[PDB]
Amino acid sequence: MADLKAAEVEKAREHFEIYDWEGEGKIDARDLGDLLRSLDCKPTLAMVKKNGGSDKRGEKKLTLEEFLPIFSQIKKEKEVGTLEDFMEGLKVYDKAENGTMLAAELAHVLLSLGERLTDIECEEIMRVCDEDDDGFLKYEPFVKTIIAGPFPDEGK
């Protein structure tokens, strides 16, 4: 993605009836982000505030009309599946590039810098990649695993 498609509107009319528990419409604020995430747009909490949307509970809620300019700002900017500062944002403890970094410095740097998420996910970036006893764990496959995705396309 890099522009709105006609099917992402046709997807969003369907998924409108999910968000309001009645089968009507009115996008919940955390389920604001779940709609953008099921349409290939996965901003940060600081990019959400730039588009003017939401991704968490307690933030502004909108209707589906109001969702289209918010959705369109992410398309112009990063995070629609673009590469820059993902597996380009990792490694600085190694001045070698073997496509590896240290195991210890690949699970407590996402916890000591970053927006900071779960210790289980800190354990998935270590699990997707190869293991050797030389202390060399790859960083670059866990990201491509995300490119593969549950659905590379528009979720359902």
Binding site: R37, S38, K42, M47, E88, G89, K95, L110, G114, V143
Partner: protein
């Protein structure tokens, strides 16, 4: 520190670039100075600038216009306060030193000098030595962070991981400025990455914490500084021993071990003392510190002078009092796990070295030979070794030089009477220096030998004083071999590869270079070939040692000045020999009287071995007076009654220097330059005129001039295509753009294709700080690790669960009709009835 968060305030002063930058404007304080050829700096104006040459007018002195390979002068303000100072417009070591002069008072003693960096220090602690400021510059490479020894080692961690060679940090320079102190800063950088760093906590002690045990490698250095540095004629201490620690890093770069190869610790040096200074105050660490009680138990009493009145000087400490090494070494032994019982035994053999010698606290009124104040005779020499002779004192007072069973009495000035006792104490103090190798490596190594590993030398420098003989030979010749690598790798080998790569930048050499011209066994500097040939058989005629030196003609750089024989041929008077710097004076007798090693001018018979078990193990290899018995090689053995090495000790050391040279062609050397603070001593006085003279004779100024046109460090082109993660990765193309073309855009290519880097075939030649700037952009995007990727984490979770919610879209439409039917069928009942007990 250089960046401290507000919640990390419990033990550390905050530093913030939020709002203020720690004074929002940066500003200058420099002037234009020109280097004197006496003392200090004096004002001067630029007359004309015709490129990199700069003709100067000293205001109230003289005018120059000569070459800048012998003219050194402080750059404009703009070209002070810069890193990798060899990239400037005016190529001066004087701008590095001046920038370092202001900064020494402000306790910041590193300022770059291209590849290398210059240093001025008292050989003591300052608060810049903290581990806190090491983690800040952690992964910042060469440039990006304020100049320091930790970022040299980082610049070298990365150029090691970017050249596809091994690396070897070494310390070049003239002693006066901390070499042993600077070693600690190399070993402590590898201690940090070798145990890794997640970056400064949001906590500091409350709550006492912060421990790592990689520090114990670092503490290896102050133990050896005690048995190596003391007051000399340059600042508070100077190095006068050779340290060569080969610290092993693993196949990651993680620190685990270190191999201490001890060179030579001075073979004199209690028996004689320098004039108005001291020569070595490290035998006096139990004369003003240590265990004072085991000073009187060994039978040594010196009568204090009770303040100067003239009978000494000779004895005269101008710096902070003896036993200044005693505090450094005692704290450092406990970190290493170096036993309390093991330090006691060092200090014994050191007061054994005092019983033959001493001159403290003033000269005897008829000796004219080493002895103590209180008239203790040679009875205290005999208490620990059991020596006897009817020539044991009061016949050593008269100089005698023993060649065989004969007594050839030739030469001998009055300050030089102390070879007649010799000889064992010299052989006991160097061997004590090697005792330290058997204990400290027991705890340091956990594995040994493997790549990477760094060859780190900390050797001697330039010293003046009449009394010098065999003592500084295998100390100074090590600096001379390293001086020659600095002038080989930069000028001769460096331009040979720019003629073997079809490079039209051939031969750019600026004089005073040595390129293995002293690696010959028979032309090193002239004296050392002669020591080694006549320490093999009974011979202690210094006339022949002076005669073969007076048939040796070497020179093209400082490394030989003509001798003055004790009688025949040329006169008496103090001759000299050059190493790399000025004139270094030397005595007529005492070369083979400091290596054949007299006892009391009676041939050894069992007197070469002690009477104590502890004095006995000290003796291993070293000739004794008289005949020698076969065997002794390397540095091993267990001593013999007559002689203890049939071979010279120094020729066993020659085997290590032929090998150290071949291992620096097996390494990419990054140097740490130490330049003399001043030759008048006392810290907090830097007279740049005296420094300027040392910056001309060793050839450091030509060394600035060469780092601009030519380049020492040698890397490869594909390292910009791999090492990075920003100028690499998907972010910047690797492999789809020329590997030369990346380097050329951030740094430019506007006559920087031979003024920034030499462009070769499969290899580029960088300063090894050219890499720090390139990496400076890289860490900017890498700053947060990683806020972009945590949003993708939440991508696949919300959309996978949204499946449970997507089948709920039709289900919501069923419960809404059903809730209406909950009340409709309650007005229209008799529409239910199902199994229970009520049906009919």
């Amino acid at each position: 520190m250089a960046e401290d968060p507000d919640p990390t305030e419990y033990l550390y002063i905050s530093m913030e670039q939020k709002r203020k930058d720690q004074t929002k404007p940066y500003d200058g304080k420099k002037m234009v100075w020109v280097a004197d050829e006496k003392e200090g700096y004096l004002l001067g104006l630029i007359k004309s600038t015709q490129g990199d040459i700069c003709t100067v007018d000293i205001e109230g002195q003289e005018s120059r216009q000569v070459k800048k390979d012998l003219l050194q002068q402080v750059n404009p303000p703009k070209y002070e306060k810069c890193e990798d100072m060899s990239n400037l417009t005016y190529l001066n070591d004087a701008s590095v030193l001046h920038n370092l002069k202001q900064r020494y008072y402000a306790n910041l003693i590193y300022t770059y000098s291209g590849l290398f960096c210059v240093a001025i220090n008292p050989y003591k602690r300052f608060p810049i030595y903290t581990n806190r400021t090491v983690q800040i510059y952690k992964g910042r490479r060469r440039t990006e962070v304020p100049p320091h020894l930790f970022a040299i080692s980082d610049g070298a961690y990365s150029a090691m991981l970017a050249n596809r060679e091994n690396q070897s940090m070494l310390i070049t320079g003239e002693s006066g400025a901390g070499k042993t102190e600077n070693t600690k800063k190399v070993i402590a950088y590898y201690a940090n990455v070798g145990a890794a760093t997640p970056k400064p906590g949001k906590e500091a002690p409350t709550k006492e914490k912060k421990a790592t045990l990689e520090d114990q490698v670092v503490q290896t250095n102050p133990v050896l500084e005690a048995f190596g540095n003391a007051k000399t004629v340059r600042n508070d201490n100077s190095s006068r021993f050779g340290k060569f620690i080969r610290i092993h890093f693993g196949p990651m770069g993680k620190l685990a071990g270190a191999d201490i190869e001890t060179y030579l610790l001075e073979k004199a040096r209690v028996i004689s003392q320098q004039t108005l200074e001291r020569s070595y105050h490290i035998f006096y660490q139990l004369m003003s510190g240590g265990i004072e009680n085991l000073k009187a138990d060994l039978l040594l009493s010196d009568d204090i002078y009770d303040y100067h009145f003239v009978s000494q000087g000779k004895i005269e400490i101008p710096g902070v009092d003896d036993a200044e090494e005693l505090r450094l070494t005692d704290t450092a032994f406990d970190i290493l796990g170096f036993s309390h019982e093991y330090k006691t035994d060092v200090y014994k053999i050191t007061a054994s070295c005092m019983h033959l010698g001493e001159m403290k606290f003033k000269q005897r009124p008829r000796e004219e030979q080493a002895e103590a104040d209180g008239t203790e005779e040679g009875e205290r020499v005999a208490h620990l070794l059991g020596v006897n002779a009817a020539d044991l004192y009061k016949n050593l007072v008269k100089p005698k030089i023993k060649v065989g069973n004969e007594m050839v009495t030739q030469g001998r000035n009055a300050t030089q009477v102390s070879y007649s006792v010799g000889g064992l104490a010299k052989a006991m103090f160097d061997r004590t220096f090697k005792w330290l190798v058997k204990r400290l490596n027991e705890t340091l190594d956990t594995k040994q030998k493997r790549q990477y590993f760094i060859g780190v030398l900390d050797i001697a420098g330039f010293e003046i004083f009449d009394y010098n003989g065999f003592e500084q030979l295998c100390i100074n010749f090590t600096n001379e071999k390293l001086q020659q690598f600095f002038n080989h790798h930069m000028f001769v080998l460096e331009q040979e590869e720019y003629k073997r790569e079809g490079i039209d930048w051939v031969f750019i050499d600026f004089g005073l270079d040595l390129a293995a011209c002293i690696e010959l066994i028979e032309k090193p500097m002239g004296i050392l070939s002669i020591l080694e040939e006549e320490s093999m058989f009974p011979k202690a005629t210094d006339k022949s040692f002076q005669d073969k030196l007076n048939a040796n003609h070497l020179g093209k750089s400082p490394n030989f000045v003509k001798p003055k024989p004790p009688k025949p041929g040329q006169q008496e008077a103090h001759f000299s020999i050059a190493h790399y710097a000025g004139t270094v004076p030397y005595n007529i007798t005492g070369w083979l009287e400091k290596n054949k090693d007299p006892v009391n001018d009676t041939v050894v018979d069992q007197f070469k071995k002690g009477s104590n078990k502890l004095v006995q193990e000290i003796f291993e290899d070293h000739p004794g007076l008289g005949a020698e018995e076969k065997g002794g090689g390397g540095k091993g053995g267990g001593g013999r009654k007559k002689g203890a090495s049939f071979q010279t000790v120094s020729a066993l050391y020659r085997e290590q220097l032929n090998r150290l040279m071949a291992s620096l062609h097996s390494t990419q050397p990054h140097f740490v330059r130490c330049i003399i603070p001043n030759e008048l001593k006392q810290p907090g006085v830097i007279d740049s005129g005296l420094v300027m003279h040392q910056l001309t004779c060793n050839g450091v100024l030509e060394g600035i001039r060469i780092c601009r046109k030519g380049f020492p460090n040698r890397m490869v082109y594909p390292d910009f295509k791999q090492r990075y993660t920003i100028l690499a990765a998907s972010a910047v193309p690797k492999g789809f753009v020329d590997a030369k073309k990346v380097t050329e855009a951030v740094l430019g290519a506007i006559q920087l294709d031979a003024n920034d880097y030499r462009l070769g075939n499969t290899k580029v030649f960088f300063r090894a700080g050219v890499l720090g700037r390139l990496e400076e952009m890289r860490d900017d995007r890498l700053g947060k690790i990683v806020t972009w990727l945590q949003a993708w984490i939440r991508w696949y979770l919300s959309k996978k669960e949204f499946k449970k919610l997507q089948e709920q879209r039709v289900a919501l439409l069923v419960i809404q009709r059903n809730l209406r039917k909950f009340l409709t069928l309650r007005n229209w009942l008799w529409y239910k009835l199902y199994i229970k007990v009520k049906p009919l």
